[PDB]
Design an enzyme around this catalytic site. Sequence first.
Site, PDB file in Angstrom:
ATOM      1  N   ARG A   1      12.741  -6.716  -7.218  1.00  0.00           N
ATOM      2  CA  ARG A   1      12.903  -5.563  -8.099  1.00  0.00           C
ATOM      3  C   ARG A   1      14.086  -4.713  -7.679  1.00  0.00           C
ATOM      4  NH1 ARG A   1       9.079  -0.544 -10.139  1.00  0.00           N
ATOM      5  NH2 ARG A   1       8.970  -0.010  -7.905  1.00  0.00           N
TER       6      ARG A   1
ATOM      7  N   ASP B   1       4.630   5.354 -14.017  1.00  0.00           N
ATOM      8  CA  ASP B   1       6.030   5.701 -14.229  1.00  0.00           C
ATOM      9  C   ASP B   1       6.208   6.512 -15.511  1.00  0.00           C
ATOM     10  OD1 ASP B   1       6.857   4.072 -11.882  1.00  0.00           O
ATOM     11  OD2 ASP B   1       6.285   2.377 -13.150  1.00  0.00           O
TER      12      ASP B   1
ATOM     13  N   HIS C   1       0.838  -1.193   0.000  1.00  0.00           N
ATOM     14  CA  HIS C   1       0.000   0.000   0.000  1.00  0.00           C
ATOM     15  C   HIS C   1       0.877   1.249   0.000  1.00  0.00           C
ATOM     16  CE1 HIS C   1      -3.822   2.057   0.658  1.00  0.00           C
ATOM     17  NE2 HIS C   1      -4.432   0.894   0.806  1.00  0.00           N
TER      18      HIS C   1
ATOM     19  N   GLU D   1      10.517   2.497 -18.439  1.00  0.00           N
ATOM     20  CA  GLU D   1       9.734   3.526 -17.760  1.00  0.00           C
ATOM     21  C   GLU D   1       9.569   4.787 -18.599  1.00  0.00           C
ATOM     22  OE1 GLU D   1      10.560   4.305 -13.655  1.00  0.00           O
ATOM     23  OE2 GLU D   1      11.454   2.322 -13.341  1.00  0.00           O
TER      24      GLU D   1
ATOM     25  N   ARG E   1       1.538  -0.367 -11.759  1.00  0.00           N
ATOM     26  CA  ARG E   1       0.495   0.458 -11.175  1.00  0.00           C
ATOM     27  C   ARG E   1       0.212   1.683 -12.044  1.00  0.00           C
ATOM     28  NH1 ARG E   1       0.222   1.619  -6.227  1.00  0.00           N
ATOM     29  NH2 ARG E   1      -0.710   3.694  -6.510  1.00  0.00           N
TER      30      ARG E   1
ATOM     31  N   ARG F   1       9.879  10.027  -7.336  1.00  0.00           N
ATOM     32  CA  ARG F   1       9.197   8.806  -7.738  1.00  0.00           C
ATOM     33  C   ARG F   1       7.762   9.105  -8.163  1.00  0.00           C
ATOM     34  NH1 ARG F   1      12.332   3.895  -6.867  1.00  0.00           N
ATOM     35  NH2 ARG F   1      10.208   3.061  -7.138  1.00  0.00           N
TER      36      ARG F   1
END
Lengths: 931, 931
Positions: free
Chosen positions: B443, B590, B168, B553, B628, B756
Amino acid sequence: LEKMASIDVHLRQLVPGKVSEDDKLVEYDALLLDRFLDILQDLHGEDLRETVQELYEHSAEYEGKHEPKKLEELGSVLTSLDPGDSIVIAKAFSHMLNLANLAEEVQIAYRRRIKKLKKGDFVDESSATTESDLEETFKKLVGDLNKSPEEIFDALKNQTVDLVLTAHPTQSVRRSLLQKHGRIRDCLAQLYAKDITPDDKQELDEALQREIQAAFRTDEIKRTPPTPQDEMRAGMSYFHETIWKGVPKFLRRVDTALKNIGIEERVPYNAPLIQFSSWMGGDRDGNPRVTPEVTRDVCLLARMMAATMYFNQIEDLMFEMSMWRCNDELRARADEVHANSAKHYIEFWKSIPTTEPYRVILGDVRDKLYHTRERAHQLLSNGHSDVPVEATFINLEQFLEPLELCYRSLCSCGDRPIADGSLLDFLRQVSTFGLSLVRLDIRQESDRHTDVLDAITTHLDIGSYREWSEERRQEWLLSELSGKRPLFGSDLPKTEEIADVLDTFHVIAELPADSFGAYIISMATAPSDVLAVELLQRECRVKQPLRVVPLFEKLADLEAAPAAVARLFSVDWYKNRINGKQEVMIGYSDSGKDAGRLSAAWQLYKAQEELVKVAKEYGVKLTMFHGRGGTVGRGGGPTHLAILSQPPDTINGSLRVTVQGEVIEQSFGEEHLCFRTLQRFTAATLEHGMRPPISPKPEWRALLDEMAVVATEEYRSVVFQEPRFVEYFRLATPELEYGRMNIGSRPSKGGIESLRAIPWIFAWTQTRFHLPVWLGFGSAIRHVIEKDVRNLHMLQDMYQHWPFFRVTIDLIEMVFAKGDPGIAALYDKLLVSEELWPFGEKLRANFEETKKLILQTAGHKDLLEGDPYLKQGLRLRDSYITTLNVCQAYTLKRIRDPSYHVTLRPHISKGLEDTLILTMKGIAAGLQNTG
Amino acid sequence: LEKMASIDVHLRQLVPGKVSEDDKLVEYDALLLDRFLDILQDLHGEDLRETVQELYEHSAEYEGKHEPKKLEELGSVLTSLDPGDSIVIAKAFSHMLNLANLAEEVQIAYRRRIKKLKKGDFVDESSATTESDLEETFKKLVGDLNKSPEEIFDALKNQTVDLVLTAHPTQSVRRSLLQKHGRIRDCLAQLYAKDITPDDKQELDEALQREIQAAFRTDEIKRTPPTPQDEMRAGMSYFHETIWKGVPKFLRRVDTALKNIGIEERVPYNAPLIQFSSWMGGDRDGNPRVTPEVTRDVCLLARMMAATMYFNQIEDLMFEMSMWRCNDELRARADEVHANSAKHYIEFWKSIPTTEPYRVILGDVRDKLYHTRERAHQLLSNGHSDVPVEATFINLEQFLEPLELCYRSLCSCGDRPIADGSLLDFLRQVSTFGLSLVRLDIRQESDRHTDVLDAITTHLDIGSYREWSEERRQEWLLSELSGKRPLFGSDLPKTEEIADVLDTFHVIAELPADSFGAYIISMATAPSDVLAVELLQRECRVKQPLRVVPLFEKLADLEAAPAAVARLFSVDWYKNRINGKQEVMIGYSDSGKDAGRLSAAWQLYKAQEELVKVAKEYGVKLTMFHGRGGTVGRGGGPTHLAILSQPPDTINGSLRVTVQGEVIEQSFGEEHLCFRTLQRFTAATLEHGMRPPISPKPEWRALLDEMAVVATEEYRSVVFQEPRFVEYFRLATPELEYGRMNIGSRPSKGGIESLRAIPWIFAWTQTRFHLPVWLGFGSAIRHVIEKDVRNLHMLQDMYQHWPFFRVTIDLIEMVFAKGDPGIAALYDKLLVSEELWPFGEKLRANFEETKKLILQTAGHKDLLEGDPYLKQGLRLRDSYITTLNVCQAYTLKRIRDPSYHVTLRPHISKGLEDTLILTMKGIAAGLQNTG
Ligand SMILES: [Cl-]
Ligand SMILES: [Cl-]
């Protein structure tokens, strides 16, 4: 496959009307029977299914009109089957009957009650559809008796209902089969939900078929006549099934009903309104398989089962108890427990922090429960452990203290609602079940204690305790219980039996007192019998001795019982040892075997009256323990009236009843059934304490005293005086094969006097004749009607207005519903000598006459006229039982008579003893309780 | 106490109409809010309750007409609260919002579907009320697409949906609160059963209150930003909640739907239609808290949870498996297993006899499961065991072999129906969940692998791998992979980071391969990154290397991705290592941080097109991993069309989707929601494989290329070119406080380029502004409408006929529903310099214009015109979220500016950082997923 059209027709002819409009019983059993017959066809062929269905249709037609041709048609098929087909057909009818039972339970569990069907009197309390629920009982006490709600609440606080689980007289159904039956009932119930989708319904149908097949494809005969430990394991299944979850749910409903009359408190969580006791592993009366080790084993097994359940339940409790605000006392405990070594919740938390104090305390409780379980397991499987006794819970107070600390703390901070959730359920489960789930009673013959004391006195050169009169026995026992010197040591010639008795006491001394209830003396007759047990207990170093409970069985023993109990209360030592409490046991079946059933019934009412008089004289709180065979041991609604029928003040907030093994599935197998069982015991106990049944009119007492004499005359003249009765009993009934087979234990533990009561009832229940239950009623009622024209009216008044009499007759009527003289005649024709045929003929005439007379007494034209739901379900089961009857009869003829050659039929697709066992287990499962 | 009457009116004014006739949402939330406010009054006084309810009434009035005066009315109250009252009010509105979510989930789970509302096209697949279920998907494939049932079945056999559970971005809700929410939902649903009795309803109401108070009275702060093992523990809770029981139910439903089109087989029990993966404990990208020990820990914890669930599940299986008829193979194994040393079923059986062979084998399986759990536990808490590895299950075949033996034998004896019960469910659970429930992905950034190889090559006196061109890197890596000499030893200067990378590989090597999934390379740009990971894997002695997955990305990386993947497939070594399978990961969020959302969307469609072309060229089966931020990461019906929208052949029976933590409760919290989630993933994957979306018209592609150019121009000119943008971002948004606080990890790997994606989206989502989601769409649509009059008609055609475009626009429309420029303006007024105010004013105008243009494109007058149920639920939450917005704004001003003194109010009956954290968690829970 239009075969379904035929069984539906037959089912609808068997159960014609509708006992309501949610009456789906025929639908239920039709569905289960169709699915079963399809499974049977797939596994054993089309011919086998057709043969079986032809048999069932003939059986149902028979239960309709009772045409004897239908019985001859059943027999013609059943004798021509080779042992393989005989086994498959017998198995098939056993499972078909089981399915009828399951449909009946679902129908009972989901039948809507009718408020408009209540008449307003006590007769309503004899059926589940009209009986008073908890709150209706409250409002009946408030309106009609003008009792205040606080008095009702105070009565409930100190009331205890004590349910005693005893071993099944036959197939104690294995835990796995109980679970399968549960799945079948669940699939059935869900299939009729009035909102279900097509795919849900299809998958439920497939699940139902799958489960019916699973039950049909497990063997239920081989291995061993299960060791007493195994029978105890199977008997404990109902705690996991329904009772464990059921107790806190029921108690919470008690709270809600108390709120609906103005009471704001809850029933205190430590109040033992519900208790459970067990004989499984403790009753040694005529059972040498029950050894000292058996008792030790079942005690430790019970401590394990309980610790397991608490362990699994306290993890959900730990997740719920996530509060942080707490008491000063609890915060202190949280800081103390945090100073230690968290192995049983790594999947949940790495460790429990001090900002979750309730979780800290509860986590340590989970640790102690784990150590208790593993320790009892180590004691059971070895004899020693290594688990420190200080790391476990040894008594119930160690367990309750931290939970109560959590409850108090939560209430301090206005979190009472949080406390009244999973935590309240837990507290009530700890109070109800303790560390053992059940408390084990020990039972033994008085004569065995006499043998022990006789070997002792002979060893001391003082005489034989056996030759001594009762007064001399008492005098010596009294000098020893009051003395300071021990009685015996290892230097004592012990026979095998005497060593069994003494070793049982030693095992009792080596186990926790929380595991034991009462020491019950079978065949108790005199105060020396009780004092012998108290002395043997004390001299075997039992620190906390068990309470001694005499079981007065024979009729004369009942008459002398209040005198013996008075003499016991009058002895100073026994008076100060019992601490104001005495429990006495009565055995309805036991006394009936002695003197017939009607005489035993009236004698037990009187015996309880006089015992209450003695208890009031000496200021002792009396507890009557109802053994098997009673009106209070029936299944369902009838028990409610039976409890209300007991003589005034015999209960006084303390009820102890045997839950017979043939009824325990009907009472605790399903969720609703469990709740309603607990409810009617609780409500009837509460109501009887405040509202006794009417006192009998003097002429009723005199009339029953007369009838008892005539009934004992007929019963004993047939059972004990007729010389060839025993010869007939060995022919017309499978009594010999029952003991020889594999079930139970020993039937003798000479003649009938040495025969135990259970085989006595069983042997005649198998043949649908039920002689031990009704014999004696006929001549008694004939005698009083003939003596005076008006006595019939008096009997009819008693049945209508005296609860005791109504429940006694009602039980007889129910047993007659399960009886069929035609089938018994078939047993006579196949198994009994010709010169004994008139004897059985005469007995059957007695059967018929009593039936009419019982009907005349109850004001009925048909049996069970007032309870059509039970008549309906019994007719349903009887259609399956009849086939097992005819099969059992011809199988008996084949076993006993190898000169009886039969024209066999070709085997039908992929040992007569196994057939016989199947029919016994089946018939027993279909007739359930009689007397 | 007539307060309930006002909140009922306010809810009815907020949600006026009825979106159906089982629309009980307003009733549900009115009930929950009444019960909550009563609890709040009881715990913290009447004054506190009146203050809170005045706030909620004003909030609903605001969400009605959006009068700015309402916001100042809220603010005047919220600033005058001392930090104690501030904490109580913030906590209260957080739990109120949670209750609104729970009501919405119950509404979703029990809303009746509408067959007559289907339009017949793909738009129906954008909402749960109209989407196609499994069987409707089957008939859609059979009728319209002319696929044979055999072809559908063969596709299902080879299909896999792989759902990846990620941590989360904020409050990973603790397992205890998941359970509490479950109880609240259950009480809600049962209170509205159209058959409930008065006492059941009363006790359910009391359980509902009890649970709401229990959830409100647990603290949700202190301690640590939970250790990755704790966050993983919380993330796995959904397996116990719904997924463990849920998977076999769904698979069985697939079997049923197959029967309804003529397929007689079941989906093979070993077919992995459903798989679960986890990043919890595996993602190290910019997260130093995820250490090698953390990964080892969550691996062993997962193996433990799995062993526990299998162990508890196999006992009921052992009760069901009581058959005796069996295979020759199974009978042989039963006699073999019977020769051994039964400690985990003495409560069930003394010992398992050989006449129950399935119970023998299954009991040995239960024993091996017990040893598996206790061994994994011993490794976790120590580092070694003593439990022989041969006494456990190490791989899935050791586990499946005896279970499959039982299944074969049961089928041999005509007991297949019994086999398709608990046994089929068990086999399907072993196949779905393995020995770990989830497979952990690892990752790490590519740059870290560059650092490791650079230390290696510098240590070998060959140069710096970092200075080497991409081609020189490739050539060296290939010479090493094809060679036999190892690369390095203990003699290697390791920095803390380099040692971290190598140690992670060493932990992967020492654990079972069944515990791991994919090794994901963040910021992947070139084939040398993948070859670097493959070489480091091999030289760290990982016997079964993980599959390597590049994450492209930035936008330029996406353009170069298909060339890089082709170069990888062309090298013989990599081609032989992958064995015909390759997985590539794309990150919608991303890529959006780099070049705006519209451009990232069109670039990801095109990039997937080209990747499929390469995969077909070289004969490799491609799996696209959706990170995501995607359309396939939404909640509910939208996911169905999002999956159907992907370019042709990009799925090919292999779907891999991130289940975002902000959606996982809405998707797996409840039984029905779980089933429907699994169903739509399965159905959409199956349909997409056989019925690809239409290929875009050439003018559509040309138009999106142009719009992408204008949108990237606007996005970069505002985010990256504006000199004072960074100051504004630090003032008008709580980004600084988010990283400094406690949630997640580190937000900067400098400016926005190093920021990020998660903090980028979060910061603007907190202010109800959502600039990262919609910025760039405005100018893109404005440009094309002005360039050509007809382009609007083209845009509207695409939204109506191109699924990719419709889902892309639909997400924007949904995000605008959660946006409110007035609240964002309030943040500007309190926290931003006066000379920067016009900057925010201009951005808000852009917000408005973009919103109008999105509406024009979708053919709508109001937002979410086509999904009124979702519009209703979002409008419901907005009333609670707005209060936490105003509270958060004034709290931010109070933290940053101690020169802002407020006139406080007296404390109300029984630390501003805590309040800020509360508002962040609350708004996060109410807005859930955006971009
Ligand atoms: Cl044992
Ligand atoms: Cl850990």
